[PDB]
């Protein structure tokens, strides 16, 4: 009976987050007593257009960082606006959410509080079909195994080192399979914390289980993990290649951009030709956040320049945002999108991000945030959505490796290739 | 009949270090699925039962799990398939006597432990009741004190700390979720005060800070700092713990404490800890000597146990026969429970039951190398051992523990263990 998908009632709580902050999950019981459960991850180097992450500002607790009014939102306004609604229509679900908000940016019930129910809501929903979580996602795109790019070397707002670049990430293009490109990326990861000893470079962890040393500079960054996949008995190129996350909203001030760690300050113009060269003497193949997220005019001399050499990834600049991806399409700016489901708050505006992106040619990274929870929901929106290409952390610290771990849960009974080197 | 096992099989995936390790799922023949997977240490001690590996070179630095999961897929769910997994006692039983070792060298720890808490899990979600409900054994539960690594060092860091861990423990708060709160607030604070001291705030393997250090003193120091930057107590909101892990710095007829420049013999030493306690209102130490120092751990309990907890972690092994021949001698007065020393959640009981029938305390732990599973949450509370060792307050390897606990505290109306874990 579809009656056995109506929800009985939603509550949240309060929980903490891989940084050790406060974030929100939420429960949705259905009448049958199913539970669906979900929790939200959160940023640190956020975009200035993100949907509101609210939070209770008491000094007392948690330092301003408690969550407790985007639960209450969950316990009584969203609880008693969906009880007796069925869960097996997200996007109805998802619409009377933003309708409950009726804000643009989701500041009055929180875009934590929507999100929460959101997937809670998905989670409710497959449970009822008794079927992977993964399977009940797909909206008819071709599902494969995705490529990931791991961020072995944290920097910028993730870590507490010189490095101004927020992300170093290496991407086992080259794997038969996603066990194996498993298996390659972790591989690395050990080399490289053995190359990093041995030169006396520091080897505890940033917030997404990257090594945080200070660097001489970018490139030398990059001449270490190169050597850790030599050292790991891998080839450049054919097996491995990198992905950069620069962040360089975090950089941006005064109308130039600084990489204090080299002593140098780019204007836009400089700063691209900065990536043409890093290109040419390392096998990048996708930067992310390259520029600033109001870098309109950057972003596509950056895209015309180079657009067709590499893949340029908004992050900042798109906010995971349909309205504002739409724009840039129409200005000829990136070409592919990381998605990050709390940046716009409801599963089904997150799908509307990634179809505006496939239907013109842009390509989808599902992402984690710095802050993360024991949820794993992006592995299996990975899948789904066939975007083929993944980014949630190195390869230590349970915030990463359960998404990981998850991915190879979906690998087992899903039969699906792995995407490998069609991402280019 | 809902009970009865209808397939078990396992599979390798990662622990929060990057190193592989077993999950395993027991299906009953309702289709209920019961899940459970293994954490891995670092600081092993030399009796700890046998975590199984590969040593293939090629796949994981020699690391990977593949024999271990083939021992699940093929003889032990042979072994098993038909039997219920009402009766915990039973199936450890026969895995145990399949594997037909002492230490289950043949079978694995690893491999046996993942089916062991697995059907636990699927027995609860036959019985539909809560986990933590489903393992109480008689006991009073209580909401655990947690001791919190915010600071690590020794087997766990990349940094000069010899001793492993430095842990607050927030003994004065209410009920849990305030204890939860103090101990964050504390180790957001501590890297402050560490960064204004340009010390490093990257994080070691359980998420506390890996600074290097003048001495341990300092290392107490920047943490009663903290504590009292936080606006919080020392002795009545805040208390220390210790994991000095000494077997790690047991070396030749001496405790080497690289870090001070100094080497202590086991007489020494014991005087170390007493000038420490007189300075700093530790009331806990772990593993103060090696695991081999029957007669300095004997003394240290005479000299000291009743001033301050005596954990045996590496003394012990969460091995019942071992913690029987400890008992007997007198030596320390509480024990560390890591289910993955042991192998089966029976043999662990055995630990536990052993510990409270001679007054020694539990300490209920996690290991270094965790994963997302969060048995040990719901295990502190149904033992009512009172104590959880389970990390600093980042890495989701240890938050999803405190989530754990902030779950069970939401419907199971416990008290918090407080103060009264000092009686
Ligand atoms: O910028 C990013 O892409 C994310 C993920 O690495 O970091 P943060 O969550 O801090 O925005
Ligand atoms: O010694 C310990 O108590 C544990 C937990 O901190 O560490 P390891 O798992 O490495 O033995
Ligand atoms: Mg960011
Ligand atoms: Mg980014
Ligand atoms: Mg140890
Ligand atoms: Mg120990």
Redo the contacts between chains.
Sequence with gaps: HHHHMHIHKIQA????????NPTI?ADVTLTTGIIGRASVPSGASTGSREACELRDNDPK???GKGVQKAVKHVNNEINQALQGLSVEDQENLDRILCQLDNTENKSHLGANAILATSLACARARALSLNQPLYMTLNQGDMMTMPVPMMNILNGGAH???NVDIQEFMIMPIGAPDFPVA??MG??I??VLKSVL?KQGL?????DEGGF?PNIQSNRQALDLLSEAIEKAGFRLGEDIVFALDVAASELFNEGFYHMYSENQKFDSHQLIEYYANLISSYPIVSIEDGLDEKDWSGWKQLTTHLGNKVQLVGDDLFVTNPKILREGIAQGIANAILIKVNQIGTLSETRQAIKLAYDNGYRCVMSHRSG???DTFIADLAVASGCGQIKTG??????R??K??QL??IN?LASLPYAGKNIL
């Design positions: 709580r309060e929980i903490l987050d891989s940084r050790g999950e607790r948690y330092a870590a507490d080192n498993l298996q972790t591989e990861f050990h000893k520091n080897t505890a962890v940033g945080a993360e929870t024991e190195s390869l230590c610290r349970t915030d490796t359960a990981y771990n190879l849960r087992e």
